């Protein structure tokens, strides 16, 4: 993975709100999704990659390879895993393994606009984030 390296803040919250309630999310974290644009900051720490996720409720850093399922401890009170693989350098299936299980979230960059389609059986929230230098 080296293509979409940077800090990334949300351009459109298309249904990034009912996707959280379908998983089962608290009435405090369910609205920073569609309010304070998540800083999903994908960066190489030496050799393997680190999400420096800096939001108002989830301000947290987590390091990972393309393979091992990395866990984030959330402001609901939930340690949620994320099974990673790069297809190549604009399609990466970083699939969130929660106490409900999120369905394949497919991180596809559309020319410096990181488009990760979050579905959960039947939702599909097109998460589009702009590259910040």
From Swiss-Prot:
Gene Ontology MF annotations: lipid binding
Compartments it resides in: Cytoplasm
Broad class of where this protein is predominantly found: cytoplasm
Binding site for (9Z)-octadecenoate: 107, 127-129
InterPro entries to which the protein is assigned, alphabetical: Calycin, Fatty_acid-bd, ILBP, Lipocln_cytosolic_FA-bd_dom
Keywords: Cytoplasm, Lipid-binding, Transport
Tissue expression remark: Tubercles, muscle layers and body.
Pfam families per record: Lipocalin
GO cellular component: cytoplasm
Amino acids binding (5Z,8Z,11Z,14Z)-eicosatetraenoate: 107, 127-129
Record text about domains: Forms a beta-barrel structure that accommodates hydrophobic ligands in its interior.
Protein family (similarity comment): Belongs to the calycin superfamily. Fatty-acid binding protein (FABP) family.
Function: May play a role in the transport of fatty acids. Binds various fatty acids, such as arachidonic, oleic, palmitic and linolenic acid (in vitro).
The protein's name: 14 kDa fatty acid-binding protein
Organismal lineage: Eukaryota, Metazoa, Spiralia, Lophotrochozoa, Platyhelminthes
